[model samples]
Target chain A: MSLIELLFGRKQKTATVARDRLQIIIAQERAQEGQTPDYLPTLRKALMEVLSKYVNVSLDNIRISQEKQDGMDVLELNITLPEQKKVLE
Target chain B: MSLIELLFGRKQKTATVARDRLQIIIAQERAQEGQTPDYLPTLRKALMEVLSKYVNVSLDNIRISQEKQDGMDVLELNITLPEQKKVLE
Candidate 1:
Protein backbone atom coordinates (compact mmCIF):
# COMPACT_ATOMS: atom_id res chain seq x y z
CA MET A 1 0.00 0.00 0.00
CA SER A 2 1.11 3.59 -0.56
CA LEU A 3 2.73 5.15 2.50
CA ILE A 4 -0.01 7.74 2.97
CA GLU A 5 -2.63 5.08 2.33
CA LEU A 6 -1.28 3.11 5.25
CA LEU A 7 -2.53 5.76 7.65
CA PHE A 8 -6.09 4.69 6.89
CA GLY A 9 -5.16 1.09 7.48
CA ARG A 10 -5.52 -0.51 10.87
CA LYS A 11 -1.87 -1.61 10.71
CA GLN A 12 0.96 0.60 9.54
CA LYS A 13 4.75 0.34 9.60
CA THR A 14 6.96 3.20 10.75
CA ALA A 15 9.97 3.94 8.59
CA THR A 16 12.42 5.80 10.82
CA VAL A 17 15.64 6.05 8.83
CA ALA A 18 13.84 7.05 5.69
CA ARG A 19 12.04 9.81 7.58
CA ASP A 20 15.17 11.05 9.35
CA ARG A 21 17.00 11.64 6.11
CA LEU A 22 14.09 13.64 4.76
CA GLN A 23 14.05 15.94 7.79
CA ILE A 24 17.74 16.69 7.46
CA ILE A 25 17.19 17.56 3.84
CA ILE A 26 14.12 19.61 4.69
CA ALA A 27 15.98 21.46 7.41
CA GLN A 28 18.65 22.27 4.87
CA GLU A 29 16.05 23.24 2.33
CA ARG A 30 14.28 25.45 4.82
CA ALA A 31 17.55 27.19 5.61
CA GLN A 32 18.11 27.78 1.94
CA GLU A 33 14.63 29.23 1.77
CA GLY A 34 15.54 31.80 4.43
CA GLN A 35 14.40 29.92 7.51
CA THR A 36 17.25 29.10 9.81
CA PRO A 37 17.71 25.63 11.30
CA ASP A 38 17.75 27.43 14.62
CA TYR A 39 14.11 28.20 13.92
CA LEU A 40 13.36 24.53 14.47
CA PRO A 41 14.65 24.54 17.98
CA THR A 42 12.86 27.81 18.53
CA LEU A 43 9.68 26.33 17.17
CA ARG A 44 10.00 23.36 19.46
CA LYS A 45 10.55 25.56 22.45
CA ALA A 46 7.64 27.73 21.46
CA LEU A 47 5.35 24.73 21.09
CA MET A 48 6.26 23.47 24.53
CA GLU A 49 5.93 26.92 26.00
CA VAL A 50 2.54 27.47 24.46
CA LEU A 51 1.28 24.03 25.42
CA SER A 52 2.64 24.22 28.94
CA LYS A 53 0.21 27.08 29.51
CA TYR A 54 -2.41 24.36 29.85
CA VAL A 55 -0.50 21.17 30.69
CA ASN A 56 2.04 20.85 33.44
CA VAL A 57 4.90 19.40 31.39
CA SER A 58 8.21 18.63 33.01
CA LEU A 59 11.38 19.33 31.08
CA ASP A 60 12.69 15.81 31.61
CA ASN A 61 9.44 14.30 30.45
CA ILE A 62 9.41 16.18 27.17
CA ARG A 63 11.18 15.01 24.06
CA ILE A 64 11.54 16.76 20.69
CA SER A 65 13.38 15.44 17.69
CA GLN A 66 13.36 15.31 13.89
CA GLU A 67 14.02 12.71 11.23
CA LYS A 68 13.20 11.61 7.70
CA GLN A 69 11.53 8.35 6.69
CA ASP A 70 10.33 6.88 3.45
CA GLY A 71 11.09 10.13 1.59
CA MET A 72 9.23 12.32 4.11
CA ASP A 73 10.46 14.63 6.86
CA VAL A 74 9.04 13.85 10.31
CA LEU A 75 9.12 15.73 13.61
CA GLU A 76 8.20 14.11 16.89
CA LEU A 77 7.42 15.75 20.24
CA ASN A 78 6.47 13.50 23.11
CA ILE A 79 5.71 14.74 26.60
CA THR A 80 5.10 12.47 29.53
CA LEU A 81 3.76 13.83 32.78
CA PRO A 82 3.67 12.42 36.27
CA GLU A 83 0.59 10.45 37.27
CA GLN A 84 -2.32 12.76 37.98
CA LYS A 85 -2.95 11.18 41.39
CA LYS A 86 0.63 11.77 42.45
CA VAL A 87 0.61 15.36 41.18
CA LEU A 88 -2.75 16.10 42.75
CA GLU A 89 -1.55 15.11 46.20
CA MET B 1 6.60 0.10 22.48
CA SER B 2 8.14 3.52 21.92
CA LEU B 3 7.85 4.76 18.32
CA ILE B 4 11.56 5.17 17.72
CA GLU B 5 12.50 1.97 19.50
CA LEU B 6 10.26 0.27 16.97
CA LEU B 7 12.61 1.46 14.25
CA PHE B 8 15.31 -0.71 15.70
CA GLY B 9 12.92 -3.60 15.88
CA ARG B 10 12.74 -5.97 12.94
CA LYS B 11 8.96 -5.78 12.93
CA GLN B 12 8.83 -2.02 12.57
CA LYS B 13 5.36 -0.92 11.55
CA THR B 14 4.99 1.83 9.03
CA ALA B 15 2.68 4.60 10.19
CA THR B 16 1.85 6.22 6.86
CA VAL B 17 -1.19 8.31 7.73
CA ALA B 18 0.30 9.53 10.94
CA ARG B 19 3.37 10.43 8.94
CA ASP B 20 1.30 12.22 6.29
CA ARG B 21 -0.55 14.33 8.83
CA LEU B 22 2.78 15.25 10.33
CA GLN B 23 4.10 16.18 6.89
CA ILE B 24 1.10 18.41 6.29
CA ILE B 25 1.71 20.15 9.57
CA ILE B 26 5.42 20.40 8.81
CA ALA B 27 4.68 21.89 5.42
CA GLN B 28 2.41 24.37 7.11
CA GLU B 29 4.89 25.08 9.85
CA ARG B 30 7.66 25.55 7.33
CA ALA B 31 5.52 27.96 5.37
CA GLN B 32 4.62 29.80 8.51
CA GLU B 33 8.30 30.11 9.28
CA GLY B 34 8.93 31.64 5.80
CA GLN B 35 9.79 28.46 3.87
CA THR B 36 7.09 28.30 1.27
CA PRO B 37 5.31 25.03 0.63
CA ASP B 38 6.07 25.88 -2.96
CA TYR B 39 9.68 25.15 -2.10
CA LEU B 40 8.80 21.51 -1.63
CA PRO B 41 7.78 21.04 -5.23
CA THR B 42 10.78 23.02 -6.28
CA LEU B 43 12.97 20.82 -4.09
CA ARG B 44 11.52 17.69 -5.66
CA LYS B 45 12.08 19.00 -9.15
CA ALA B 46 15.60 20.05 -8.26
CA LEU B 47 16.44 16.65 -6.78
CA MET B 48 15.18 14.83 -9.86
CA GLU B 49 16.89 17.26 -12.22
CA VAL B 50 20.21 16.77 -10.45
CA LEU B 51 19.89 12.99 -10.11
CA SER B 52 18.70 12.47 -13.70
CA LYS B 53 22.11 13.64 -14.92
CA TYR B 54 23.51 10.27 -13.81
CA VAL B 55 20.45 8.00 -13.81
CA ASN B 56 17.73 7.76 -16.45
CA VAL B 57 14.78 8.00 -14.09
CA SER B 58 11.27 8.01 -15.46
CA LEU B 59 8.99 10.70 -14.10
CA ASP B 60 6.57 8.03 -12.94
CA ASN B 61 9.33 6.41 -10.90
CA ILE B 62 10.01 9.62 -8.98
CA ARG B 63 7.71 9.91 -6.00
CA ILE B 64 8.32 12.67 -3.41
CA SER B 65 6.30 12.90 -0.23
CA GLN B 66 6.47 14.15 3.37
CA GLU B 67 5.09 13.42 6.84
CA LYS B 68 5.48 13.77 10.61
CA GLN B 69 5.54 11.28 13.47
CA ASP B 70 5.76 11.21 17.27
CA GLY B 71 7.53 14.60 17.07
CA MET B 72 9.59 14.68 13.89
CA ASP B 73 9.00 15.93 10.37
CA VAL B 74 9.84 13.40 7.64
CA LEU B 75 10.09 13.61 3.87
CA GLU B 76 10.25 10.70 1.47
CA LEU B 77 11.44 10.63 -2.14
CA ASN B 78 11.21 7.23 -3.75
CA ILE B 79 12.54 6.84 -7.28
CA THR B 80 12.16 3.46 -8.90
CA LEU B 81 14.50 2.98 -11.80
CA PRO B 82 13.90 0.88 -14.89
CA GLU B 83 15.41 -2.58 -14.96
CA GLN B 84 19.00 -2.39 -16.11
CA LYS B 85 21.01 -4.66 -18.35
CA LYS B 86 24.52 -4.37 -19.72
CA VAL B 87 24.48 -2.03 -22.72
CA LEU B 88 27.49 -2.70 -24.89
CA GLU B 89 28.25 -2.20 -28.54
Candidate 2:
Protein backbone atom coordinates (compact mmCIF):
# COMPACT_ATOMS: atom_id res chain seq x y z
CA MET A 1 0.00 0.00 0.00
CA SER A 2 1.15 3.51 -0.66
CA LEU A 3 2.13 5.66 2.31
CA ILE A 4 -0.53 8.20 1.43
CA GLU A 5 -3.28 5.61 1.86
CA LEU A 6 -1.69 4.27 5.01
CA LEU A 7 -1.61 7.74 6.54
CA PHE A 8 -4.69 9.44 5.03
CA GLY A 9 -6.83 6.67 3.56
CA ARG A 10 -7.69 6.58 -0.18
CA LYS A 11 -8.51 9.90 -1.75
CA GLN A 12 -10.68 9.06 -4.83
CA LYS A 13 -10.80 5.24 -4.94
CA THR A 14 -8.42 5.58 -7.87
CA ALA A 15 -5.47 4.00 -6.18
CA THR A 16 -4.40 0.71 -7.79
CA VAL A 17 -5.18 -1.77 -5.02
CA ALA A 18 -5.73 -4.69 -7.37
CA ARG A 19 -2.65 -4.01 -9.45
CA ASP A 20 -0.55 -3.56 -6.35
CA ARG A 21 -1.71 -6.88 -4.94
CA LEU A 22 -1.00 -8.65 -8.23
CA GLN A 23 2.46 -7.15 -8.54
CA ILE A 24 3.32 -8.32 -5.07
CA ILE A 25 2.45 -11.91 -5.97
CA ILE A 26 4.44 -11.86 -9.24
CA ALA A 27 7.51 -10.61 -7.46
CA GLN A 28 7.76 -13.85 -5.50
CA GLU A 29 8.44 -15.99 -8.59
CA ARG A 30 11.28 -13.76 -9.81
CA ALA A 31 12.91 -14.07 -6.41
CA GLN A 32 12.99 -17.83 -6.78
CA GLU A 33 15.10 -17.52 -9.95
CA GLY A 34 17.57 -15.21 -8.18
CA GLN A 35 17.15 -12.81 -11.10
CA THR A 36 17.06 -9.03 -10.88
CA PRO A 37 13.90 -6.90 -10.71
CA ASP A 38 13.89 -6.09 -14.43
CA TYR A 39 13.26 -9.73 -15.26
CA LEU A 40 9.75 -9.69 -13.79
CA PRO A 41 7.99 -8.26 -16.85
CA THR A 42 9.81 -10.61 -19.20
CA LEU A 43 8.91 -13.62 -17.09
CA ARG A 44 5.28 -12.54 -16.83
CA LYS A 45 4.96 -12.12 -20.59
CA ALA A 46 6.58 -15.49 -21.20
CA LEU A 47 4.20 -17.13 -18.76
CA MET A 48 1.27 -15.51 -20.43
CA GLU A 49 2.30 -16.94 -23.81
CA VAL A 50 2.60 -20.44 -22.36
CA LEU A 51 -0.76 -20.24 -20.60
CA SER A 52 -2.54 -18.69 -23.57
CA LYS A 53 -2.36 -22.02 -25.41
CA TYR A 54 -4.43 -23.75 -22.71
CA VAL A 55 -6.61 -20.92 -21.36
CA ASN A 56 -8.22 -17.78 -22.73
CA VAL A 57 -6.58 -15.44 -20.25
CA SER A 58 -6.28 -11.83 -21.28
CA LEU A 59 -3.01 -9.98 -20.82
CA ASP A 60 -4.55 -7.15 -18.83
CA ASN A 61 -6.12 -9.57 -16.39
CA ILE A 62 -2.75 -10.96 -15.32
CA ARG A 63 0.01 -9.10 -13.57
CA ILE A 64 3.50 -10.27 -12.55
CA SER A 65 6.54 -8.62 -11.02
CA GLN A 66 9.45 -8.92 -8.59
CA GLU A 67 10.07 -7.32 -5.22
CA LYS A 68 12.56 -7.34 -2.36
CA GLN A 69 11.57 -8.39 1.13
CA ASP A 70 13.88 -8.58 4.14
CA GLY A 71 16.86 -8.42 1.76
CA MET A 72 15.38 -11.32 -0.19
CA ASP A 73 13.80 -11.40 -3.67
CA VAL A 74 10.12 -12.29 -4.05
CA LEU A 75 7.72 -12.84 -6.97
CA GLU A 76 4.15 -11.53 -7.12
CA LEU A 77 1.50 -12.86 -9.49
CA ASN A 78 -2.13 -11.87 -9.79
CA ILE A 79 -4.81 -13.06 -12.18
CA THR A 80 -8.36 -11.87 -12.51
CA LEU A 81 -10.56 -14.46 -14.22
CA PRO A 82 -13.86 -13.64 -15.88
CA GLU A 83 -16.90 -13.95 -13.68
CA GLN A 84 -19.86 -16.00 -14.91
CA LYS A 85 -23.22 -14.19 -15.10
CA LYS A 86 -26.55 -16.07 -15.18
CA VAL A 87 -28.72 -15.34 -18.25
CA LEU A 88 -32.56 -15.11 -17.87
CA GLU A 89 -34.34 -16.50 -20.90
CA MET B 1 34.04 -36.33 -0.35
CA SER B 2 31.89 -38.67 -2.40
CA LEU B 3 29.07 -40.57 -0.62
CA ILE B 4 30.78 -43.80 -1.67
CA GLU B 5 33.59 -43.06 0.78
CA LEU B 6 31.27 -41.65 3.43
CA LEU B 7 29.52 -45.00 3.73
CA PHE B 8 32.33 -47.41 2.71
CA GLY B 9 35.74 -45.91 3.39
CA ARG B 10 38.13 -48.17 1.52
CA LYS B 11 38.76 -47.70 -2.20
CA GLN B 12 42.14 -47.53 -3.91
CA LYS B 13 42.08 -43.89 -4.98
CA THR B 14 42.96 -41.92 -8.08
CA ALA B 15 40.07 -39.51 -8.07
CA THR B 16 40.43 -35.71 -8.34
CA VAL B 17 41.14 -34.85 -4.69
CA ALA B 18 42.50 -31.36 -5.45
CA ARG B 19 39.80 -30.59 -8.01
CA ASP B 20 37.11 -31.77 -5.65
CA ARG B 21 38.43 -29.53 -2.87
CA LEU B 22 38.71 -26.60 -5.26
CA GLN B 23 35.18 -27.18 -6.56
CA ILE B 24 33.81 -26.81 -3.01
CA ILE B 25 35.66 -23.50 -2.67
CA ILE B 26 34.45 -22.29 -6.09
CA ALA B 27 30.87 -23.31 -5.28
CA GLN B 28 30.97 -21.04 -2.26
CA GLU B 29 32.00 -18.11 -4.46
CA ARG B 30 29.25 -18.78 -7.03
CA ALA B 31 26.69 -18.91 -4.23
CA GLN B 32 27.61 -15.31 -3.43
CA GLU B 33 27.19 -13.86 -6.96
CA GLY B 34 23.61 -14.92 -7.78
CA GLN B 35 24.52 -16.14 -11.29
CA THR B 36 23.97 -19.34 -13.27
CA PRO B 37 26.46 -22.22 -13.75
CA ASP B 38 27.35 -21.33 -17.37
CA TYR B 39 28.37 -17.87 -16.21
CA LEU B 40 31.54 -19.34 -14.72
CA PRO B 41 33.03 -20.14 -18.11
CA THR B 42 32.14 -16.71 -19.49
CA LEU B 43 33.56 -15.01 -16.40
CA ARG B 44 36.77 -17.01 -16.65
CA LYS B 45 37.16 -16.00 -20.27
CA ALA B 46 36.56 -12.32 -19.54
CA LEU B 47 38.90 -12.30 -16.54
CA MET B 48 41.62 -13.97 -18.54
CA GLU B 49 41.38 -11.31 -21.22
CA VAL B 50 41.87 -8.56 -18.63
CA LEU B 51 44.50 -10.32 -16.52
CA SER B 52 46.59 -11.67 -19.37
CA LYS B 53 48.02 -8.20 -20.08
CA TYR B 54 49.48 -8.02 -16.55
CA VAL B 55 50.15 -11.66 -15.72
CA ASN B 56 51.43 -14.51 -17.89
CA VAL B 57 49.23 -17.16 -16.33
CA SER B 58 47.75 -19.98 -18.41
CA LEU B 59 43.96 -20.17 -18.98
CA ASP B 60 43.76 -23.68 -17.53
CA ASN B 61 44.66 -22.39 -14.05
CA ILE B 62 41.71 -20.02 -13.65
CA ARG B 63 38.18 -21.00 -12.69
CA ILE B 64 35.09 -18.81 -12.22
CA SER B 65 31.34 -19.41 -11.92
CA GLN B 66 28.13 -18.96 -10.00
CA GLU B 67 26.38 -21.08 -7.39
CA LYS B 68 23.13 -21.06 -5.42
CA GLN B 69 22.56 -21.27 -1.67
CA ASP B 70 19.35 -20.70 0.23
CA GLY B 71 18.02 -20.05 -3.29
CA MET B 72 20.34 -17.06 -3.66
CA ASP B 73 23.09 -16.48 -6.21
CA VAL B 74 26.85 -16.37 -5.62
CA LEU B 75 29.99 -16.01 -7.75
CA GLU B 76 33.03 -18.24 -7.23
CA LEU B 77 36.57 -17.76 -8.55
CA ASN B 78 39.75 -19.78 -8.18
CA ILE B 79 43.18 -19.07 -9.67
CA THR B 80 46.48 -20.88 -9.43
CA LEU B 81 49.84 -19.40 -10.31
CA PRO B 82 52.44 -21.20 -12.40
CA GLU B 83 54.92 -22.98 -10.15
CA GLN B 84 58.48 -21.74 -10.23
CA LYS B 85 60.72 -24.66 -11.20
CA LYS B 86 64.32 -23.73 -10.37
CA VAL B 87 66.93 -24.95 -12.85
CA LEU B 88 70.67 -25.18 -12.15
CA GLU B 89 72.70 -23.15 -14.64
Candidate 3:
Protein backbone atom coordinates (compact mmCIF):
# COMPACT_ATOMS: atom_id res chain seq x y z
CA MET A 1 0.00 0.00 0.00
CA SER A 2 2.72 2.48 1.00
CA LEU A 3 4.87 1.49 -1.97
CA ILE A 4 1.90 1.91 -4.33
CA GLU A 5 1.13 5.38 -2.97
CA LEU A 6 4.78 6.36 -3.13
CA LEU A 7 5.04 5.31 -6.79
CA PHE A 8 1.73 6.65 -8.12
CA GLY A 9 0.63 9.23 -5.50
CA ARG A 10 -2.32 8.49 -3.13
CA LYS A 11 -5.21 10.10 -5.02
CA GLN A 12 -4.01 8.88 -8.38
CA LYS A 13 -3.49 5.45 -6.85
CA THR A 14 -7.12 5.23 -5.80
CA ALA A 15 -8.19 6.45 -9.23
CA THR A 16 -5.93 3.81 -10.74
CA VAL A 17 -7.55 1.22 -8.51
CA ALA A 18 -10.98 2.32 -9.66
CA ARG A 19 -9.84 2.25 -13.25
CA ASP A 20 -8.32 -1.16 -12.73
CA ARG A 21 -11.59 -2.52 -11.37
CA LEU A 22 -13.50 -0.97 -14.26
CA GLN A 23 -11.02 -2.48 -16.68
CA ILE A 24 -11.59 -5.87 -15.16
CA ILE A 25 -15.34 -5.51 -15.60
CA ILE A 26 -14.98 -4.24 -19.14
CA ALA A 27 -12.44 -6.88 -20.00
CA GLN A 28 -14.63 -9.64 -18.60
CA GLU A 29 -17.63 -8.34 -20.50
CA ARG A 30 -15.64 -8.23 -23.69
CA ALA A 31 -13.97 -11.59 -23.06
CA GLN A 32 -17.40 -13.16 -22.71
CA GLU A 33 -17.94 -11.37 -26.05
CA GLY A 34 -20.08 -8.37 -24.91
CA GLN A 35 -22.38 -6.53 -22.52
CA THR A 36 -25.14 -7.88 -20.34
CA PRO A 37 -28.88 -7.69 -20.95
CA ASP A 38 -31.73 -7.05 -18.53
CA TYR A 39 -33.21 -10.45 -19.24
CA LEU A 40 -30.06 -12.54 -18.86
CA PRO A 41 -30.46 -13.58 -15.24
CA THR A 42 -34.09 -14.40 -15.73
CA LEU A 43 -33.19 -16.47 -18.74
CA ARG A 44 -30.43 -18.18 -16.81
CA LYS A 45 -32.65 -19.00 -13.86
CA ALA A 46 -35.47 -20.21 -16.01
CA LEU A 47 -33.06 -22.26 -18.08
CA MET A 48 -31.72 -23.72 -14.87
CA GLU A 49 -35.23 -24.76 -13.86
CA VAL A 50 -35.97 -26.64 -17.06
CA LEU A 51 -32.60 -28.39 -17.15
CA SER A 52 -32.60 -29.51 -13.53
CA LYS A 53 -35.45 -31.90 -14.20
CA TYR A 54 -33.07 -34.02 -16.25
CA VAL A 55 -29.55 -33.21 -15.15
CA ASN A 56 -27.55 -32.04 -12.18
CA VAL A 57 -26.70 -28.45 -13.04
CA SER A 58 -25.58 -25.25 -11.40
CA LEU A 59 -25.26 -21.52 -12.07
CA ASP A 60 -21.53 -21.79 -12.69
CA ASN A 61 -22.11 -24.20 -15.55
CA ILE A 62 -24.19 -21.64 -17.44
CA ARG A 63 -23.19 -18.43 -19.14
CA ILE A 64 -25.90 -16.26 -20.66
CA SER A 65 -24.63 -13.14 -22.36
CA GLN A 66 -24.73 -10.98 -25.46
CA GLU A 67 -22.10 -11.56 -28.11
CA LYS A 68 -21.06 -10.43 -31.55
CA GLN A 69 -21.16 -13.17 -34.13
CA ASP A 70 -20.14 -12.53 -37.72
CA GLY A 71 -21.63 -9.02 -38.06
CA MET A 72 -24.58 -9.22 -35.73
CA ASP A 73 -25.18 -8.95 -32.02
CA VAL A 74 -26.49 -12.19 -30.57
CA LEU A 75 -27.35 -13.69 -27.26
CA GLU A 76 -25.00 -16.59 -26.48
CA LEU A 77 -26.18 -19.21 -24.08
CA ASN A 78 -23.44 -21.62 -23.08
CA ILE A 79 -23.65 -24.48 -20.65
CA THR A 80 -20.97 -26.93 -19.62
CA LEU A 81 -22.89 -30.12 -19.07
CA PRO A 82 -21.56 -33.09 -17.14
CA GLU A 83 -20.95 -36.60 -18.34
CA GLN A 84 -24.06 -38.47 -19.43
CA LYS A 85 -25.85 -41.64 -18.41
CA LYS A 86 -26.27 -42.66 -22.08
CA VAL A 87 -29.78 -41.31 -22.70
CA LEU A 88 -30.85 -38.08 -24.39
CA GLU A 89 -32.86 -35.70 -22.22
CA MET B 1 -62.63 -43.33 -43.98
CA SER B 2 -64.61 -44.46 -47.02
CA LEU B 3 -65.63 -40.90 -47.81
CA ILE B 4 -61.99 -39.78 -47.74
CA GLU B 5 -60.99 -42.66 -49.99
CA LEU B 6 -63.93 -41.84 -52.35
CA LEU B 7 -63.16 -38.09 -52.37
CA PHE B 8 -59.54 -38.64 -53.22
CA GLY B 9 -57.98 -41.64 -55.03
CA ARG B 10 -56.10 -44.07 -52.71
CA LYS B 11 -52.57 -43.18 -53.78
CA GLN B 12 -53.51 -39.50 -53.84
CA LYS B 13 -55.28 -39.88 -50.48
CA THR B 14 -52.19 -41.35 -48.86
CA ALA B 15 -50.14 -38.64 -50.55
CA THR B 16 -52.53 -36.05 -49.14
CA VAL B 17 -52.16 -37.46 -45.66
CA ALA B 18 -48.39 -37.34 -46.01
CA ARG B 19 -48.62 -33.75 -47.22
CA ASP B 20 -50.80 -32.86 -44.27
CA ARG B 21 -48.23 -34.15 -41.81
CA LEU B 22 -45.42 -32.32 -43.60
CA GLN B 23 -47.48 -29.15 -43.66
CA ILE B 24 -48.09 -29.37 -39.93
CA ILE B 25 -44.37 -29.79 -39.30
CA ILE B 26 -43.51 -26.93 -41.59
CA ALA B 27 -46.23 -24.72 -40.16
CA GLN B 28 -45.11 -25.37 -36.61
CA GLU B 29 -41.55 -24.63 -37.65
CA ARG B 30 -42.61 -21.40 -39.33
CA ALA B 31 -44.80 -20.36 -36.43
CA GLN B 32 -41.83 -20.79 -34.13
CA GLU B 33 -39.99 -18.54 -36.64
CA GLY B 34 -37.49 -21.05 -38.04
CA GLN B 35 -36.10 -24.55 -38.09
CA THR B 36 -34.74 -26.12 -34.92
CA PRO B 37 -31.01 -26.02 -34.44
CA ASP B 38 -29.33 -29.19 -33.18
CA TYR B 39 -28.09 -27.31 -30.14
CA LEU B 40 -31.48 -26.00 -29.09
CA PRO B 41 -32.79 -28.88 -27.05
CA THR B 42 -29.44 -29.14 -25.32
CA LEU B 43 -29.59 -25.46 -24.53
CA ARG B 44 -33.14 -25.82 -23.23
CA LYS B 45 -32.36 -28.74 -20.97
CA ALA B 46 -29.32 -26.95 -19.55
CA LEU B 47 -31.29 -23.75 -19.08
CA MET B 48 -34.00 -25.70 -17.32
CA GLU B 49 -31.35 -27.09 -15.00
CA VAL B 50 -30.04 -23.70 -13.93
CA LEU B 51 -33.46 -22.06 -13.53
CA SER B 52 -34.84 -24.83 -11.35
CA LYS B 53 -32.57 -23.50 -8.62
CA TYR B 54 -34.83 -20.48 -8.21
CA VAL B 55 -38.34 -21.04 -9.45
CA ASN B 56 -41.00 -23.63 -10.03
CA VAL B 57 -40.54 -23.81 -13.79
CA SER B 58 -41.46 -26.50 -16.29
CA LEU B 59 -40.71 -27.25 -19.93
CA ASP B 60 -44.06 -25.67 -20.92
CA ASN B 61 -43.08 -22.41 -19.24
CA ILE B 62 -40.13 -22.08 -21.55
CA ARG B 63 -39.94 -21.33 -25.24
CA ILE B 64 -36.58 -21.07 -26.97
CA SER B 65 -37.05 -20.09 -30.55
CA GLN B 66 -35.37 -18.34 -33.43
CA GLU B 67 -37.02 -15.24 -34.81
CA LYS B 68 -36.48 -12.71 -37.52
CA GLN B 69 -36.59 -9.20 -36.15
CA ASP B 70 -36.62 -6.59 -38.92
CA GLY B 71 -33.89 -8.17 -41.05
CA MET B 72 -31.88 -10.06 -38.47
CA ASP B 73 -32.36 -13.59 -37.23
CA VAL B 74 -32.28 -13.84 -33.45
CA LEU B 75 -32.78 -16.36 -30.69
CA GLU B 76 -35.73 -15.58 -28.46
CA LEU B 77 -35.84 -16.93 -24.92
CA ASN B 78 -39.24 -16.59 -23.35
CA ILE B 79 -40.30 -17.83 -19.95
CA THR B 80 -43.66 -17.49 -18.24
CA LEU B 81 -42.69 -16.74 -14.68
CA PRO B 82 -45.11 -16.97 -11.80
CA GLU B 83 -45.75 -13.80 -9.86
CA GLN B 84 -45.89 -12.58 -6.22
CA LYS B 85 -42.42 -13.24 -4.91
CA LYS B 86 -40.95 -10.07 -3.41
CA VAL B 87 -37.37 -10.88 -4.27
CA LEU B 88 -35.00 -11.12 -7.14
CA GLU B 89 -33.41 -14.49 -7.85
User: Which regions of candidate 2 fall more than 4 Å away from where they truly are?
Assistant: A1-42, A69-71, A83-89, B1-89
Best by TM-score: 1
lDDT of 1 by residue, A1-89 (tens): 34334322456544332111112212211111121124235445555664464344566666667874433344566554332323334
Deviation (Å) of B83 in candidate 2: 28
TM-score of each: 0.31, 0.25, 0.25
* True interface contacts reproduced, per candidate: 0.00, 0.00, 0.03
Runs in model 1 lying further than 4 Å from the true structure: A1-22, A25-89, B1-37, B66-75
Compose the digit string of candidate 1's lDDT tens values, residues B1-89: 34333323457444432111111122211211121124344444545664464445666666667765443344576554343334656
Interface RMSD, all candidates in order, equals: 18.5, 19.7, 24.7
Worst 10 residues of 2 chain A by lDDT: A22-31
Model 1 CAPRI quality: incorrect
- CA lDDT of A61 in candidate 1? 64
Candidate 1 chain B, run of 10 with poorest lDDT: B19-28
Better of 1 and 3 by TM-score: 1
Tens-place lDDT digits, model 2, residues A1-89: 32223222436544333211111122111112222234334434544664454334577777655445432343445544332323556
Please give, for residues B1-89, the per-residue lDDT of candidate 3 as tens digits.
22222212336222111110000000001122222233334554555565555444566666565533321233445454443334557
Chain B TM-score list for all models: 0.44, 0.36, 0.33
- Native-referenced DockQ of model 1: 0.03
- The stretch of ten residues in a row with the least summed lDDT in candidate 1 chain A is A27-36
